[PDB]
Amino acid sequence: EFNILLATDSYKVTHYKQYPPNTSKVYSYFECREKKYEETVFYGLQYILNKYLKGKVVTKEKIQEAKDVYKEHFQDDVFNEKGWNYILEKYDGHLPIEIKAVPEGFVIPRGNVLFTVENTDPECYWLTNWIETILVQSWYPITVATNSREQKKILAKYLLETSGNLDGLEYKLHDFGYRGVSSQETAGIGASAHLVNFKGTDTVAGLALIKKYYGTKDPVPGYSVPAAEHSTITAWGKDHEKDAFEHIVTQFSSVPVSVVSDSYDIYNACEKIWGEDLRHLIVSRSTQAPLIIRPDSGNPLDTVLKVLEILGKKFPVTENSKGYKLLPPYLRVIQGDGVDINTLQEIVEGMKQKMWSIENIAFGSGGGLLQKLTRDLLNCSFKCSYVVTNGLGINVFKDPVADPNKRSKKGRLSLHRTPAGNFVTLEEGKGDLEEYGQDLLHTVFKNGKVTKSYSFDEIRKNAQLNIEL
Amino acid sequence: EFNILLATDSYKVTHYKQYPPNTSKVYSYFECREKKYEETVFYGLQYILNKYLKGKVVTKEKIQEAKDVYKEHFQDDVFNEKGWNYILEKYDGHLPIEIKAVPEGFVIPRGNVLFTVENTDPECYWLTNWIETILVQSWYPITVATNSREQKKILAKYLLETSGNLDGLEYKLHDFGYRGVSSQETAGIGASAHLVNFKGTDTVAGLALIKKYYGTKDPVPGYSVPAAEHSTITAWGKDHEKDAFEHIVTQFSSVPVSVVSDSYDIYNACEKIWGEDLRHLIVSRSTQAPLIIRPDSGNPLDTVLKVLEILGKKFPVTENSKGYKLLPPYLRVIQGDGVDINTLQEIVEGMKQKMWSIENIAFGSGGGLLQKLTRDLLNCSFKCSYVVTNGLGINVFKDPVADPNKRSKKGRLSLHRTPAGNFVTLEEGKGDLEEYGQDLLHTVFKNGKVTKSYSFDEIRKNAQLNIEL
Ligand SMILES: Cn1nccc1C(=O)Nc1cccnc1
Numbered sequence: 011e012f013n014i015l016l017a018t019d020s021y022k023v024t025h026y027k028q029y030p031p032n033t034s035k036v037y038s039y040f041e042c043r044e045k046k047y048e049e050t051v052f053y054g055l056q057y058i059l060n061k062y063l064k065g066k067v068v069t070k071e072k073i074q075e076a077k078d079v080y081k082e083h084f085q086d087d088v089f090n091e092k093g094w095n096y097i098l099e100k101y102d103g104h105l106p107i108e109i110k111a112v113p114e115g116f117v118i119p120r121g122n123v124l125f126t127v128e129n130t131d132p133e134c135y136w137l138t139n140w141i142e143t144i145l146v147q148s149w150y151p152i153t154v155a156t157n158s159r160e161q162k163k164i165l166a167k168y169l170l171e172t173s174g175n176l177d178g179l180e181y182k183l184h185d186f187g188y189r190g191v192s193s194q195e196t197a198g199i200g201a202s203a204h205l206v207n208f209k210g211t212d213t214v215a216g217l218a219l220i221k222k223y224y225g226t227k228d229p230v231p232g233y234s235v236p237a238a239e240h241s242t243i244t245a246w247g248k249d250h251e252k253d254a255f256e257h258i259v260t261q262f263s264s265v266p267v268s269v270v271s272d273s274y275d276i277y278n279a280c281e282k283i284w285g286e287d288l289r290h291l292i293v294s295r296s297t298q299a300p301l302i303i304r305p306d307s308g309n310p311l312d313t314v315l316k317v318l319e320i321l322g323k324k325f326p327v328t329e330n331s332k333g334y335k336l337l338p339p340y341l342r343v344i345q346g347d348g349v350d351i352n353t354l355q356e357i358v359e360g361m362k363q364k365m366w367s368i369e370n371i372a373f374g375s376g377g378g379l380l381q382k383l384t385r386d387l388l389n390c391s392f393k394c395s396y397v398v399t400n401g402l403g404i405n406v407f408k409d410p411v412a413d414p415n416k417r418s419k420k421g422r423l424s425l426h427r428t429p430a431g432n433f434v435t436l437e438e439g440k441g442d443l444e445e446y447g448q449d450l451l452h453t454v455f456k457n458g459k460v461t462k463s464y465s466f467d468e469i470r471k472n473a474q475l476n477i478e479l
Numbered sequence: 480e481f482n483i484l485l486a487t488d489s490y491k492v493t494h495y496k497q498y499p500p501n502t503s504k505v506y507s508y509f510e511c512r513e514k515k516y517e518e519t520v521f522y523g524l525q526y527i528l529n530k531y532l533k534g535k536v537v538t539k540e541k542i543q544e545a546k547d548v549y550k551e552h553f554q555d556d557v558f559n560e561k562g563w564n565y566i567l568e569k570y571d572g573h574l575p576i577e578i579k580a581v582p583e584g585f586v587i588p589r590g591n592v593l594f595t596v597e598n599t600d601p602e603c604y605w606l607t608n609w610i611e612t613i614l615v616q617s618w619y620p621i622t623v624a625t626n627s628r629e630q631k632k633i634l635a636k637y638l639l640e641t642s643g644n645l646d647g648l649e650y651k652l653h654d655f656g657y658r659g660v661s662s663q664e665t666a667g668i669g670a671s672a673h674l675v676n677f678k679g680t681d682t683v684a685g686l687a688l689i690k691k692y693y694g695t696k697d698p699v700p701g702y703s704v705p706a707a708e709h710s711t712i713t714a715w716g717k718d719h720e721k722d723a724f725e726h727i728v729t730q731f732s733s734v735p736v737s738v739v740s741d742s743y744d745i746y747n748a749c750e751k752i753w754g755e756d757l758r759h760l761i762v763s764r765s766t767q768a769p770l771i772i773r774p775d776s777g778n779p780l781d782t783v784l785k786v787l788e789i790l791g792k793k794f795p796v797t798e799n800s801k802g803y804k805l806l807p808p809y810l811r812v813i814q815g816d817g818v819d820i821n822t823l824q825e826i827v828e829g830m831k832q833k834m835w836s837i838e839n840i841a842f843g844s845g846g847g848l849l850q851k852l853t854r855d856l857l858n859c860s861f862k863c864s865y866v867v868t869n870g871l872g873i874n875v876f877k878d879p880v881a882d883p884n885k886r887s888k889k890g891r892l893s894l895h896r897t898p899a900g901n902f903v904t905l906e907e908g909k910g911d912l913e914e915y916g917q918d919l920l921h922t923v924f925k926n927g928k929v930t931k932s933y934s935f936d937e938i939r940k941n942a943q944l945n946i947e948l
């Protein structure tokens with residue numbers, strides 16, 4: 011079973027002996043520190059609150075096991091057993107911590123406070139930064155959701171330019187990163203952060219997380235279609251790629267089907283196998299059930315352009331109202347290899363260059379969507395800004411001489427709306443002057459209880475694009 | 480509860496309809512495909528076998544829950560309920576799958592077979608690639624342990640060059656990546672992969688994983704020392720950093736203590752505070768309990784050099800047998816900011832340039848050790864190479880025309896020792912000819928049971944450096 015006493019950075023175990031004596035309060039905050047990615051999607055905190063932080067998290071057995079581990083881990087008896095006993099006795103293992111946070115899904119610019127953490131009991135001053143490590147890990151669902159949303163803007167910009175609308179926008183970027191993530195739990199968290207912006211996913215784990223921790227009125231927040239992998243094709247034999255294609259498109263004739271065709275020669279399959287041999291099986295398919303050709307190798311941009319040109323001369327192409335070329339509705343293309351935010355831009359710009367509408371293309375990202383993200387990307391940091399010693403509250407902060415970009419904020423923080431509708435974080439407890447609006451931060455966790463929740467439907471509404479509004 | 484039926488890629492649910500009819504066997508393998516990092520550390524498979532694959536992994540409830548989700552996920556009823564009921568009824572939920580693998584800890588060059596997967600029942604041909612996604616996720620503990628071991632080589636190369644020995648080599652790279660990872664499960668897996676090569680860790684979660692899934696004769700596989708964070712320093716006020724330093728070095732006067740000093744001015748803390756104001760507290764410290772100054776900002780190389788040069792002219796410096804400068808035993812340094820495999824090389828080379836010994840320095844790595852890694856780095860892949868249809872077995876493979884580096888192996892594979900004592904992967908069942916030795920791959924999983932295990936002590940022995948041997 012998970013033990014929160016074993017879920018922190020090792021050196022934090024020795025931090026209760028390092029704070030100034032007579033300290034009754036430790037007040038820390040979280041931010042995507044300033045110095046692309048100018049605005050971030052706040053999401054994932056609620057998951058951590060329910061799974062790891064809420065309820066009775068401290069027992070007699072967990073204190074003992076922690077004491078035994080740290081005894082050997084440090085070769086010394088540095089462990090605030092007395093501090094963890096106080097929480098067990100006076101609060102029945104419930105954490106005396108108050109967490110205020112901006113509503114999940116909210117798109118806040120860089121350099122703003124996203125959530126604040128403080129203790130509600132003067133004895134548990136050390137508890138504030140004990141749970142830093144576990145709260146910092148919300149950087150990942152924030153980063154995934156933010157980067158997925160930035161890719162959505164690119165998709166939206168080019169789709170509108172070449173088609174005239176945003177039809178099927180939330181199905182332009184599919185999640186392939188189940189096998190590409192570091193762990194099972196990661197896949198669930200990551201896929202759920204992608205579903206904030208899109209509806210297409212293959213990481214099944216992300217569905218159960220949302221249903222349990224957030225919830226949707228629809229049965230599921232994500233969907234998928236029958237598709238093929240290289241094994242289901244190559245197992246027929248190198249001389250039976252046509253038999254493989256025909257068997258698959260017939261098994262799924264009334265539903266959308268994606269077939270990978272780069273097993274031996276992607277350009278041969280499209281022109282000869284799809285475009286001649288099995289051309290009769292494609293032109294008969296319904297609009298609601300087209301064939302989706304999936305290339306998986308070569309230069310991403312160059313392959314897509316070459317695939318389209320091949321299909322263009324083997325299938326009746328129409329020029330849309332915007333002047334861009336569109337395949338017949340029974341044939342689409344999905345690029346699911348080596349696609350991140352950088353190459354996504356390069357591809358759709360290349361398609362616009364060759365007068366190809368974005369209607370023709372769908373994208374699949376794996377490690378680039380879920381794994382190729384760090385905490386340095388959005389500068390997600392957790393710092394202390396306020397403490398009270400001897401009954402005197404002082405404003406604390408870090409300010410390295412060689413790096414102004416690592417400077418922290420001072421005093422009690424509060425998020426507000428500017429007169430121009432933008433955001434502003436007030437420092438030094440200036441929010442109590444009420445020269446601005448009400449503090450946007452709502453208490454979501456207090457004394458071991460989740461005090462405010464958000465459904466996944468609310469998060470989707472909050473994280474909408476401006477072009478969609 | 481974990482559901483293996485919900486732990487696969489979405490499109491893999493529809494794959495049982497796509498294989499050629501009368502398919503009795505699906506035989507797939509795993510490799511760190513060819514075309515630095517020329518040899519990889521095999522590790523993490525045993526964890527996935529025990530936690531996810533072994534025992535009764537199929538129940539009536541899990542089959543129903545999977546059916547209900549996939550029904551809504553696909554808006555249709557494509558789900559091999561008959562296939563998952565066969566396993567439940569005939570094998571009591573136990574997976575009829577045989578997995579052969581190279582002993583964990585083994586350092587195998589790129590392009591070799593690490594493990595193989597096949598079905599032991601002709602009815603469960605579709606089962607081999609269903610569990611691809613979960614077995615592929617072993618890329619992470621492999622990639623971490625490999626990249627960690629590569630950094631160990633660099634440390635060993637310079638430490639030996641500048642000290643004459645390798646004393647304390649396994650404490651030169653400390654894990655800080657608990658807050659830098661995507662999830663809790665990741666933190667445990669990653670830290671355990673780093674502990675294969677080092678003993679310095681702050682990610683507590685990794686210890687419980689090893690004890691449960693691998694085990695060591697020593698109480699714990701990892702260790703840590705009392706250290707300070709920015710909050711435990713700044714809380715004293717900006718005008719009382721000296722009082723902060725003094726209080727911490729006194730609380731831990733008999734044990735090694737690491738104190739961060741980049742809060743306001745790193746170069747002032749070393750020369751004025753450590754080097755003048757509190758110099759008397761440092762020179763009295765034991766050799767087994769020194770002060771470890773920790774910078775955390777500015778250019779990693781430039782900061783370390785300047786810090787060392789400062790400490791050089793405030794504290795008595797000795798010159799070892801190798802001619803490299805050495806701090807007194809009661810004074811050491813640890814750089815734990817922006818340290819990956821690339822910058823690590825830059826720092827130690829810079830230290831050798833300025834006649835500084837590696838004995839003086841230790842390194843802390845967070846996101847670079849546990850997060851800044853993808854499945855692309857080592858080209859970890861899982862492809863089918865052999866199937867049996869209509870009684871006849873055929874050697875299958877993929878071979879993209881535009882990318883020769885994605886070509887897969889053919890037929891039944893086996894790993895052997897070359898006459899020169901190196902590794903080689905035999906294809907097309909040439910291993911049965913027995914022109915080489917016996918197959919080095921051991922059966923580690925069969926019909927739901929773990930048939931072979933390795934302790935973390937064996938894995939550590941197998942992952943030793945050639946310089947250590
Ligand atoms: C295009 N498509 N539609 C449904 C599923 C897929 C697909 O290709 N998925 C996928 C996931 C992970 C790795 N490879 C392919």
Ligand SMILES: Cn1nccc1C(=O)Nc1cccnc1
Nearest residue numbers: 019021655681703704706737813
């Ligand atoms: C230098 N040191 N010695 C023991 C622990 C640490 C340390 O600074 N750890 C750490 C962990 C995570 C983030 N930041 C620092």
